[PDB]
């Protein structure tokens, strides 16, 4: 039954309305999230709790091993609302440890739909074949690709002309990634983060409008 969740719901929304009666009603008047998080859909890293945030606080995109593509119109809607409409001044590009979407890359198997979702990550593991193939066990080229992938997909939107027209017109926003362990529930900064045009190369770089 889904009567857990409901029931679970219920007292969640109950037991807020108690420290502060007017949580809810307060933030309904308005979305004022300062962070957008892009991460994979897996059950084992909810956005959320793993940065100890409220609701109101965190924009959220969750795809198959976060994979952000300049013709999804799936999650560059999810940027472009966040950029410029809720103007959020982090976009975190979180990826993590063990992630399936990226052992699946790594090998053979089809898997359906999801083969050319996870192109791109296949892209990866070839363009990095030298060094993923000197790194011994099939867990550690999955791990160390899981780290290669937050790597480009943050420098995929920040080429975005959303996020480049956003710093064009003087807007303070930053593309973070970072890396979650699965095993340890730690959220680690990949240190690549992104918030300029200078930062980029001449070849992606747009002019303004
Ligand atoms: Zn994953």
Not at 13 to 23: C, G, L, N, T
Not at 32 to 58: H, K, Q
Not at 101 to 130: K, P
Not at 167 to 185: M, P
Request: charged share 20%.
């Amino acid at each position: 039954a889904l009567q857990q969740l409901f029931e679970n719901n219920v007292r969640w929304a109950e037991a807020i309305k108690q420290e502060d009666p007017d949580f809810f009603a307060k933030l309904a008047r308005q979305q004022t999230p300062e962070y957008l998080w892009i991460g994979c859909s897996d059950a084992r890293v909810p956005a959320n709790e793993i940065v100890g945030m409220l609701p109101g606080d965190l924009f959220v995109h969750r795809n198959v091993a976060n994979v952000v593509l300049h013709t999804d119109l799936n999650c560059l809607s999810v940027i472009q609302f966040a950029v410029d409409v809720l103007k959020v001044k982090h976009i975190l590009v979180t990826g993590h440890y063990g992630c399936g979407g990226v052992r699946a890359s790594l090998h053979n198997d089809q898997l359906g739909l999801i083969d050319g979702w996870l192109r791109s990550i296949r892209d990866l593991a070839y363009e990095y074949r030298e060094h993923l193939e000197q790194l011994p066990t099939e867990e550690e080229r999955v791990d160390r690709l899981c780290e290669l992938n937050v790597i480009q997909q943050v420098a995929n939107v920040s080429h975005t002309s959303i996020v480049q027209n956003a710093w064009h017109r003087g807007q303070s926003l930053s593309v973070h990634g970072c890396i979650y362990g699965i095993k340890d529930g730690l959220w680690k900064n990949l240190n690549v983060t992104v918030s300029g045009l200078d930062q980029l190369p001449p070849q992606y770089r747009l002019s303004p409008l």
